[PDB]
Amino acid sequence: GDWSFLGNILEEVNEHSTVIGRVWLTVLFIFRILILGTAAEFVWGDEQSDFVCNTQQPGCENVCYDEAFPISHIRLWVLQIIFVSTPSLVYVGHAVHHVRMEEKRKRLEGTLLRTYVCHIIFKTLFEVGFIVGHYFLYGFRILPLYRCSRWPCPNVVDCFVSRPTEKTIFILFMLSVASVSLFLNILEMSHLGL
Amino acid sequence: GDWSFLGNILEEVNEHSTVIGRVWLTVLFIFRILILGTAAEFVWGDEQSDFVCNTQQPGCENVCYDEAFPISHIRLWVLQIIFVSTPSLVYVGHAVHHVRMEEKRKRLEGTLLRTYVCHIIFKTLFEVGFIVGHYFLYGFRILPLYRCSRWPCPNVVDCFVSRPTEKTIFILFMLSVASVSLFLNILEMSHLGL
Amino acid sequence: GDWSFLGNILEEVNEHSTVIGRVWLTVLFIFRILILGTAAEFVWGDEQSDFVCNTQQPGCENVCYDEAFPISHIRLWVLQIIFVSTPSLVYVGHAVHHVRMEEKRKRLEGTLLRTYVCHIIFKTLFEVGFIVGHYFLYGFRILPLYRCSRWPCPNVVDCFVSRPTEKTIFILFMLSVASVSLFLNILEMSHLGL
Amino acid sequence: GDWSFLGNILEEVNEHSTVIGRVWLTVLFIFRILILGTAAEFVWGDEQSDFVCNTQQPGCENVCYDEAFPISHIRLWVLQIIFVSTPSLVYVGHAVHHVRMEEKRKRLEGTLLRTYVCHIIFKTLFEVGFIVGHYFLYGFRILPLYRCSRWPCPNVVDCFVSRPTEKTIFILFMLSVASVSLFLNILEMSHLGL
Amino acid sequence: GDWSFLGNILEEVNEHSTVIGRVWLTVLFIFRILILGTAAEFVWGDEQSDFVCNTQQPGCENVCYDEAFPISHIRLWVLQIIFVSTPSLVYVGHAVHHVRMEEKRKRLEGTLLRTYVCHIIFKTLFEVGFIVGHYFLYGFRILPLYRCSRWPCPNVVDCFVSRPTEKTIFILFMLSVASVSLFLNILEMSHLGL
Amino acid sequence: GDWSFLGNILEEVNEHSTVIGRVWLTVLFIFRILILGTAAEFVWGDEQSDFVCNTQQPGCENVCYDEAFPISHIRLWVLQIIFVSTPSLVYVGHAVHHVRMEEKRKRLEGTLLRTYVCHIIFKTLFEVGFIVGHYFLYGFRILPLYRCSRWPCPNVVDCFVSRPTEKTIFILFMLSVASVSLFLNILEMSHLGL
Ligand SMILES: CCCCCCCCCCCCCC(=O)OC[C@H](COP(=O)([O-])OCC[N+](C)(C)C)OC(=O)CCCCCCCCCCCCC
Ligand SMILES: CCCCCCCCCCCCCC(=O)OC[C@H](COP(=O)([O-])OCC[N+](C)(C)C)OC(=O)CCCCCCCCCCCCC
Ligand SMILES: CCCCCCCCCCCCCC(=O)OC[C@H](COP(=O)([O-])OCC[N+](C)(C)C)OC(=O)CCCCCCCCCCCCC
Numbered sequence A, B, C, D, E, F: 001g002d003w004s005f006l007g008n009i010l011e012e013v014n015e016h017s018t019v020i021g022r023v024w025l026t027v028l029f030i031f032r033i034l035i036l037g038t039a040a041e042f043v044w045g046d047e048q049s050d051f052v053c054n055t056q057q058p059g060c061e062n063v064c065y066d067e068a069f070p071i072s073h074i075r076l077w078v079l080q081i082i083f084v085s086t087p088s089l090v091y092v093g094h095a096v097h098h099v100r101m102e103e104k105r106k107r108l109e110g111t112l113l114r115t116y117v118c119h120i121i122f123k124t125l126f127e128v129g130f131i132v133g134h135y136f137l138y139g140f141r142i143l144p145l146y147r148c149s150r151w152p153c154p155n156v157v158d159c160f161v162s163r164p165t166e167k168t169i170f171i172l173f174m175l176s177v178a179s180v181s182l183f184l185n186i187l188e189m190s191h192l193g194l
């Protein structure tokens, strides 16, 4: 995974953002992108390769992995990062538009404050929504056994996941990181309210 | 995949482009290249390795994968990115040609406006065409079962795809991204019309 | 693993840090990140692939690897690096906040000294805690044999780990590096006390 | 594959080259190197791994793959890129030699025009030759079945290729790119003739 | 493996070092890091995957690889590089400390000469020690056959190593590089003595 | 493989080198390093994995691959590049030493001419020697069949190589590149003689 372009744009955002937003961006880079790269991807590298079902039926492991894990966890977290980053991109775009206008003619006020606050609200909504969606897809514990009754599987088969404990650890970790980001958005909103 | 050269040229384009075009380029980089790298490629890494057919015939899995997936989805999306980027390259080339002419002698008007509008039209056509072609090759849902009657397969065989649900998710996602890009081209054209 | 962003921020910290802290950061980069990348990851690449159990039961190898190694060692060390780096990030953030304030108006004293000392204390606590947690999960010797009685394993099965001696070597090495970092934090605190 | 050095030298060439040559270099980078990296290599990754022959003879798959694909397609395209890039390197070398001479003493004319035109001719010859050679090795359609009668294969065996349709697609695509480059060289020569 | 940070710091050292030390650093980068990356790692990639024992006992290959190769050769060379680089880091740290002091107030003498000479001595000791340790672990020839009598192996089993001749070649090569580095340290010490 | 450091140093050499030497360095980078990376490594990736012997004896494939290919071809070419690059490093080191001396006080003549000519001679010797050594290890054609009578192989066994034709192609190609480099060294020596 290459996050260099997003990294550059978010650094530009960091130049124009509140201290709490600088903290939020640092959290994003260190505790979500860095981990997703260094640690989580290796854990999920063999999710399907080391997924074993007790059956001789051709095709049952495939459909039962697809049923157990409709979307992989690491893939969901990628999308979460992207969608909680988008509003900051919108905000910095608005800011640079106004700066370009200034240059053509020749500190949050007016439209920039409305846009910044609205972007905080959007990040909050996206984050809450991704947490909720995760909870409904998988909850927050991967059990080692998965029982599957999807055709072509005869009757109910037993299947076994790779690394359920490590995956549970990282699921809970990323949830905690998301909640911290949420608290930080709340702090931004409070600070502004004052 | 290395997109650094294209990234540089498209940043140069971004220096010379309308706000809506800046948004379009941001979408291109974040929601198509970044995803294709970080997420989709891992999903399609084992498309043929974990593609199982119920048969003892040597060669049937190979021909039935070739028949089920004439071109892989990720490979089609690569080409889509390239072809919708080409017109912007043409436009910036024309612009830098005129700037070089200016320098030799020693803000869209005349040929640059015609070229920019024509490039918007080309991007629109390419995008619509790729969407249509995808729909006819695969539609927008990968089913888990594929029935195959291609020689050397005896009679009709059953074959099973890896990760059909995740792939359906990402297919729909990329379709939505393409439609957003299309709406943005429409906004460019309207803005200019005013 | 990509540590470039953290590397940049920690270099900025290095610009503003005591000689002992510069040494600590050099240790962090050379004896923990560099090793974890170059050496340890190759050792742990086949932890589950070359993990063999004497059984015909489907699913027993998976659950017995999950039981033997709840979290992989390399994954634990990643998190250790991140958490012992966080306080330095907080400290440099505070410092740059005060510098930005100075610029708006137009050498450790006051809040910066309190914050720096408190950050040293936090690094010390995190380091000690990670060492302790490692000791309780695995101790400091990976034995070649692991006996497993987790369902679906019939009775107690014998299982065998890949590369236990090399892994023991690197476990002890990283422990020694952590203890050196701890001694360096102590030296920082003493130097300041004078 | 790392093309950074060649990329740098060809950018230097781009600084000193006609508009049509700038277009040719853009084509080279985007439609040949970028594709070969992002798309074609993944298609050819399992050319021999997923190449199956109907036989129990040890060694027949190996010799029959060597016979079916004497040189892999992606490897041929690498060499094509290199050889059509070489003349531009010669041209820019000549140019920088003359510039260095100018500096020692203290816009195509004379030897630079002869060299540039001769380099266009060389690129044209190399491109035509690679197209022809490809046609004679493989034509432009990979069939799914390959019949092989090379020792140690008993009688004639049947063998099956991985991804023949996708490979045919990319073969035709790269052929079209080569023909476009050829047309561009023709345009250069015409422009100069005027 | 990423050696960029160490590379940067050692370039800074190169700015402040004797000609013989510049040669030593060039040797380090070209004949140890470059080789370890480009060549040796590919040789050792399948050390355990292609390590075959003549037995049906589950677990015997694992314990017999662990016994034959307690630590892999490439992993030992990584640590050797790191430990022979550390003293140069100490020396440049001392130097930059004194330069920072100079700046606060506003060519090897005094403490810098003592530190530089002591660092040469440390590199010499570490290098000699790593050579000796290698000799005692493995000597300098990997034989193709390894006989193993470690539980659970019944009686004495025969096991076979991957690529023993290539590995012997690279072992001897790296030994010669180490001895050259040693001679260079001797030359440094002599030059200073004059 | 990472050749960035060597690339930088050789660019510095290019700043101080004759036109023929600039050509030689361009050849080195484009026709040896670039190819070895992009093309040859993929060809040799499965040299041992797809090396099949007709036998049930455990250990015979391993010893017969070690006997057929004592050192892999790509590994030999790595070392060839390094050793033919070393003299240029020596030459630029001598040059920068003299420039540093000049600076302390405050166009090939004297020691620099002797050193440059001697370095050309060294490159010539190393190149000729590597060509000769290759010829004696393997000649210049990899045959598909290899007959092996090394213990534990019973009697003489038949073994089969992966991709012998592609490998023969690249062997001949690299030989031709080496001979071109040799001709270029001869041209350097002649030019100087005048
Ligand atoms: C922008 C606003 C977006 C709003 C989106 C609204 C979505 C509403 C979904 C309603 C679904 C109803 C049908 C349903 O309930 O389907 C049930 C089906 C089976 O479930 P099962 O537990 O019975 O069997 C085992 C499931 N097992 C294998 C995963 C463990 O599959 C499921 O669970 C359903 C899982 C649904 C997950 C939804 C994730 C939404 C994430 C939105 C992120 C927005 C960011 C801006
Ligand atoms: C610049 C202008 C370009 C115009 C291009 C016009 C192309 C016209 C194609 C006409 C094809 C007629 C024959 C046909 O219809 O062949 C039917 C054949 C079988 O199909 P089946 O469903 O019966 O069996 C299962 C198919 N299954 C395995 C994929 C699910 O294969 C197919 O489906 C045919 C799929 C055709 C996909 C075409 C994609 C075009 C993308 C153009 C992008 C342009 C960008 C500028
Ligand atoms: C910020 C403050 C954090 C405080 C955290 C407090 C945590 C308290 C944990 C108490 C656990 C009680 C239950 C227990 O004891 O569970 C026993 C269970 C089995 O163990 P077994 O030996 O009987 O069987 C074999 C184990 N075998 C496979 C690993 C070899 O699993 C175990 O061992 C338990 C291992 C526990 C490892 C805890 C690592 C904490 C790292 C904290 C880092 C903080 C950084 C800021």
Ligand SMILES: CCCCCCCCCCCCCC(=O)OC[C@H](COP(=O)([O-])OCC[N+](C)(C)C)OC(=O)CCCCCCCCCCCCC
Pocket: D067, D068, D069, D070, D083, D126, D129, D130, D133, D134, D136, D137, D138
């Ligand atoms: C600088 C000037 C260079 C001139 C080079 C002249 C080369 C002359 C070659 C003459 C070859 C005569 C013998 C012959 O004809 O051999 C026939 C043999 C079998 O062929 P088959 O079809 O009967 O059996 C199946 C073949 N199957 C497996 C590939 C499908 O193998 C073949 O096909 C032969 C394939 C020949 C491909 C030649 C590619 C040349 C590329 C030059 C690029 C220059 C760039 C500057």
Ligand SMILES: CCCCCCCCCCCCCC(=O)OC[C@H](COP(=O)([O-])OCC[N+](C)(C)C)OC(=O)CCCCCCCCCCCCC
Pocket: E067, E068, E069, E070, E083, E126, E129, E130, E133, E134, E136, E137, E138
């Ligand atoms: C800073 C000062 C450090 C001083 C370190 C002193 C270390 C003293 C070690 C004394 C070991 C005594 C027990 C012993 O001798 O164990 C014998 C055991 C078996 O050996 P075997 O041949 O009978 O069976 C086959 C061995 N086979 C599989 C490898 C071929 O394992 C062995 O060989 C033992 C191998 C020992 C290798 C030691 C490498 C030290 C590297 C230090 C680098 C320092 C850098 C600053």
Ligand SMILES: CCCCCCCCCCCCCC(=O)OC[C@H](COP(=O)([O-])OCC[N+](C)(C)C)OC(=O)CCCCCCCCCCCCC
Pocket: F067, F068, F069, F070, F083, F126, F129, F130, F133, F134, F136, F137, F138
């Ligand atoms: C700086 C000066 C360096 C001078 C080096 C002088 C080296 C003298 C070597 C003398 C060797 C005599 C014994 C011998 O002849 O051994 C014969 C043995 C078997 O050979 P076979 O054909 O009977 O069986 C099959 C061989 N098969 C599997 C490879 C196909 O293995 C062989 O072939 C022997 C291959 C020898 C290759 C030597 C490569 C030297 C490269 C030097 C590069 C210098 C760069 C500065």
